[PDB]
Amino acid sequence: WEGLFWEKASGFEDSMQFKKLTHAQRTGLSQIPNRRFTLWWSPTINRANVYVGFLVQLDLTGIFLHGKIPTLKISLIQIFRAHLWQKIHESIVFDICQILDGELDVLQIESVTKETVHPRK
RNA sequence: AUUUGGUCAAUUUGAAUACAGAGAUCAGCAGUUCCCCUGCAUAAGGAUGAACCGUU
């Protein structure tokens, strides 16, 4: 974490408060700094010890919520847009396959078959 | 001591597909108004110059 920096929330708010904006837009902007915060602390806001109840699965992902932490949910959705989770998984699988191919004769491997799976796997 | 504040929308329906939802960023130039300078025009208004005599 030596080189890193935040763009601050206040700064962000300021930047987009130089525009022809209806009050709703402004309100949304104001909200956005919380969203980021929520996302940051997501892995210790969204857990069984913190909240309890309908442990729902966010769509297309293994990201279980622990209550509609709505901002958090939104952030998660944004992150994992375009079937991202699936892509990640498949990518990893592909990588593994490649690795296997690279080291066949050393480990005594005949053939390496990527099993065709249900899209939701 | 329990619980509500937790419903994706959209499309195809008579649950399936969707899976968060669909120009950005950098840069010119002109115009708008006011000001200043400059050249020209238009009016007006000066100031001044230029030999030497004139017209029935």
Strand B footprint nucleotides (protein C-beta < 7 Å): 4, 6-8, 18-21
Which residue is it, tokens 């699965």? A57
Does an H or E element contain A32, and which?
helix A23-40
CA distance A90 to A93: 5
CA distance A23 to A45: 30
How far CA A96 is from CA of A42, A46, A102, A113, in Å, comes to 30, 31, 10, 11
Which SS3 state, helix, strand or coil, does residue A105 take?
Answer: coil
Beta bridge partners of A64: A57
The nt closest to A65 (CA vs C1′) is: B6
User: Per this entry, what is the length of chain A?
Assistant: 121
How far CA A7 is from CA of A11, A18, A37, in Å, comes to 7, 17, 12
CA distance A15 to A29: 10
Q: What is the resolution of this structure in A?
A: 3.6
A8: its two tokens: 């601050």
